[PDB]
Every structure is written in structure tokens, then in C-alpha cells.
Amino acid sequence: TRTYDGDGYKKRAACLCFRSESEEEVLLVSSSRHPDRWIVPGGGMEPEEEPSVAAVREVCEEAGVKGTLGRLVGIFENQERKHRTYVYVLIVTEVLEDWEDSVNIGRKREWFKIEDAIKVLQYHKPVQASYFET
Ligand SMILES: O=P(O)(O)O[C@@H]1[C@@H](OP(=O)(O)O)[C@@H](OP(=O)(O)O)[C@@H](OP(=O)(O)OP(=O)(O)O)[C@H](OP(=O)(O)O)[C@H]1OP(=O)(O)O
Ligand SMILES: [Cl-]
Ligand SMILES: [Cl-]
Ligand SMILES: [Mg+2]
């Protein structure tokens, strides 16, 4: 079930899944439609679901990681697609080898130095590239 803010933006949550508290490398996942492309893992908030809960849930589903939820980085809109994503830091403390999306759709994941994450997100997911700006 998709949920929506009162303005009709689909509600989403995501995490910047960093390898360590140094926040130098982040985990991206492949696009579900176009697997040669990378994205920040995230997805729809469910009804009555806290965003931090959704974020953590989605990165579990899409990236197969768990960790220490850190700060909310921010709330990011994609105007073209009409969705609004709460983006948290998550310091990955657990990397699961098989996860929901790896199994169901063959989703991939890869660590990128922040600057390289930005680079590969830029073309198709520039909003996501912007998650890293600060
Ligand atoms: O079809 P796209 O290019 O517009 O992007 C796709 C994006 O695909 P991706 O970024 O992987 O290429 C999906 O992401 P996902 O399939 O990787 O999860 C994402 O779904 P979502 O992340 O919002 O939702 P869930 O993760 O499932 O809860 C949305 O797909 P959906 O129509 O199945 O809910 C998104 O579509 P829009 O929100 O309409 O932009
Ligand atoms: Cl790191
Ligand atoms: Cl986006
Ligand atoms: Mg998703």
C-alpha cells in the first residue's frame, strides 16, 4: 500500500548506509528497472509507519543491511516523480548476504566512496546524489 502525504507525494524513506562512523563509503543498490544503474536504497512508507522505521525496513529489504540508525539527514523530494523521502544515516553494522531484493529481483549493491556515489547517482538519480551533499 502506498502512502501519501496530504499533498499527494508518495511517502518514502531511505538510508545512507555508511560503512563506518567516518561516513566515507556508502552502500548503493541497483535500480530495479535498469540494473546497470545505481540508486540509494529506499521505498514507500506504510500506513502509520514511522519514517525511521520505514527507512530501516527499506534498506533491509533493498540493500540487505542493518545498523545503528543515526540522524535524519533530511527529507528530500523528487519533484518529477512526486515522492518525498526521509533519509537517515545508518551506520552499517550488519551486511546480510541474501536479502529480499537480491532474491526477488536480483538487486545488486556496491560500496562507493562518497564522491563516487555521487558520480554514479548523478545521471538518473540526481536527488539521491544530493543526499550526500552535506
Ligand atoms: O520507475 P522509476 O524509474 O520512476 O523509479 C521507480 C523506482 O525504480 P528504480 O529507482 O529502482 O529504478 C522504484 O524503486 P525500486 O523498484 O528500486 O524500489 C520505486 O519504488 P520505491 O523505492 O518507491 O518503492 P518500494 O521500495 O517498492 O517500497 C518506484 O517504483 P514503483 O512505481 O514500483 O513504486 C519508482 O517509480 P516512481 O516512484 O514512479 O518514480
Ligand atoms: Cl565509512
Ligand atoms: Cl529520487
Ligand atoms: Mg525502493
Swiss-Prot record:
GO cellular component, one term: cytoplasm
Outcome, altering G44 to A/V: Loss of diphosphoinositol polyphosphate phosphohydrolase activity
Binding positions for Mg(2+) 3 per the UniProt entry: E58
Active site: E61
Catalytic activity: diphospho-myo-inositol polyphosphate + H2O = myo-inositol polyphosphate + phosphate; 5-diphospho-1D-myo-inositol 1,2,3,4,6-pentakisphosphate + H2O = 1D-myo-inositol hexakisphosphate + phosphate + H(+); 3,5-bis(diphospho)-1D-myo-inositol 1,2,4,6-tetrakisphosphate + H2O = 3-diphospho-1D-myo-inositol 1,2,4,5,6-pentakisphosphate + phosphate + 2 H(+); [phosphate](n+1) + n H2O = (n+1) phosphate + n H(+)
Domain of life per record: Eukaryota
pH dependence remark: Optimum pH is 7.0-7.5 for PP-InsP5 hydrolysis. Displays strong endopolyphosphatase activity at pH 6.8 and 7.4.
GO molecular function: 5'-(N(7)-methyl 5'-triphosphoguanosine)-[mRNA] diphosphatase activity; 5'-(N(7)-methylguanosine 5'-triphospho)-[mRNA] hydrolase activity; bis(5'-adenosyl)-hexaphosphatase activity; bis(5'-adenosyl)-pentaphosphatase activity; diphosphoinositol-polyphosphate diphosphatase activity; endopolyphosphatase activity; inositol diphosphate pentakisphosphate diphosphatase activity; inositol diphosphate tetrakisphosphate diphosphatase activity
Tissue note: Widely expressed. Expressed at higher level in brain, heart, pancreas and liver. Also expressed in placenta, lung and kidney.
Mutagenesis / variant outcome for changing E62Q: Loss of diphosphoinositol polyphosphate phosphohydrolase activity
Keywords: Acetylation, Cytoplasm, Hydrolase, Magnesium, Manganese, Metal-binding, Nucleus, Zinc
Free-text activity regulation comment from the record: Endopolyphospahatase activity is inhibited by NaF, NaPPi, beta-glycerol phosphate and heparin. 5-diphosphoinositol pentakisphosphate (5-InsP7) inhibits its mRNA decapping activity.
GO terms of biological process kind: adenosine 5'-(hexahydrogen pentaphosphate) catabolic process; cell-cell signaling; diadenosine hexaphosphate catabolic process; diadenosine pentaphosphate catabolic process; diadenosine polyphosphate catabolic process; diphosphoinositol polyphosphate catabolic process; diphosphoinositol polyphosphate metabolic process; RNA decapping
Residues binding substrate, per UniProt: R2, K10, K11, R12, S31, S32, R33, R81, K82, H83, R107, K125
Signal peptide: none
Outcome when changing H83L: Induces a strong decrease in Ap6A and [PP]-InsP4 hydrolysis, while it only weakly affects PP-InsP5 hydrolysis
Top-level EC class as recorded in UniProt: hydrolase
Cofactor: Mg(2+); Mn(2+); Zn(2+)
Binding site for Mg(2+) 1: G42, E62
Localization: Cytoplasm; Nucleus
Binding-site residues for Mg(2+) 2, renumbered to this chain: E58
Motif interval(s): Nudix box: 43-64
Family named by the database record: Belongs to the Nudix hydrolase family. DIPP subfamily.
Biological role stated in the UniProt entry: Cleaves a beta-phosphate from the diphosphate groups in PP-InsP5 (diphosphoinositol pentakisphosphate) and [PP]2-InsP4 (bisdiphosphoinositol tetrakisphosphate), suggesting that it may play a role in signal transduction. InsP6 (inositol hexakisphosphate) is not a substrate. Acts as a negative regulator of the ERK1/2 pathway. Also able to catalyze the hydrolysis of dinucleoside oligophosphates, with diadenosine 5',5'''-P1,P6-hexaphosphate (Ap6A) and diadenosine 5',5'''- P1,P5-pentaphosphate (Ap5A) being the preferred substrates.
Subunit structure of this chain's protein: Monomer.
Protein name as catalogued: Diphosphoinositol polyphosphate phosphohydrolase 1
Organism: Homo sapiens
Gene: NUDT3
